[PDB]
Amino acid sequence: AAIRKKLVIVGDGACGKTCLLIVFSKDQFPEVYVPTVFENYVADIEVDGKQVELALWDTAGQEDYDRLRPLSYPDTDVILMCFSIDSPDSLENIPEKWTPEVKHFCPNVPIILVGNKKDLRNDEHTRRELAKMKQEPVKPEEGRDMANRIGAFGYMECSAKTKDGVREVFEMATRAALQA
Ligand SMILES: Nc1nc2c(ncn2[C@@H]2O[C@H](COP(=O)(O)OP(=O)(O)OP(O)(O)=S)[C@@H](O)[C@H]2O)c(=O)[nH]1
Numbered sequence: 001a002a003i004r005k006k007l008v009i010v011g012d013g014a015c016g017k018t019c020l021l022i023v024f025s026k027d028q029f030p031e032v033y034v035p036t037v038f039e040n041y042v043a044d045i046e047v048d049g050k051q052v053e054l055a056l057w058d059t060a061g062q063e064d065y066d067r068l069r070p071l072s073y074p075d076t077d078v079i080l081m082c083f084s085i086d087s088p089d090s091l092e093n094i095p096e097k098w099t100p101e102v103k104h105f106c107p108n109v110p111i112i113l114v115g116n117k118k119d120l121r122n123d124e125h126t127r128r129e130l131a132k133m134k135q136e137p138v139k140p141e142e143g144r145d146m147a148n149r150i151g152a153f154g155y156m157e158c159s160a161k162t163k164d165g166v167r168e169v170f171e172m173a174t175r176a177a178l179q180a
């Protein structure tokens, strides 16, 4: 074959990590049952004339999987640090939980900053439940501003629900890994 790379995905609860993996691998969105950790799919993908076997590692942090997470880190080639466009609190934790942590187990490892649930930017229900507690949905600017802060390979937005922008997340993830 060719190039075999290991991608680990981390982020706050319900920011869409497991869903995202699935849309990318199974090629449609899981509405019925979403597991807590999607098992270990290795997915074929062709990026920049290279054939890659991308191995997807899901994580969690509530609760069992707090303890088990750091075990999925070791041999990582690319990280998907995620947050959700509809939760600015999840963004807050990018520089305060997830970067310091990643950089501890996997320094020198390329990070993609991903904001999921893109579809919920202009969802009216969403805009209102947020304004209640004096918040609005994350802007694309402040996501890219944050990717630059943490020293990320790039920034990508996607909605696994609408399937939009998902492939792009994993090309940028694969490129980031291919970069040796
Ligand atoms: N609108 C919208 N909702 C989403 C999207 N992805 C996930 N969700 C919703 O948010 C909830 C959390 O999904 P999930 O993917 O399991 O979060 P997670 O942080 O990855 O949780 P885990 O399985 O790794 S432990 C689900 O109920 C799902 O309906 C998305 O792209 N758009």
Ligand SMILES: [Mg+2]
Binding pocket: 011, 012, 013, 014, 059, 060, 061, 062
């Ligand atoms: Mg979680």
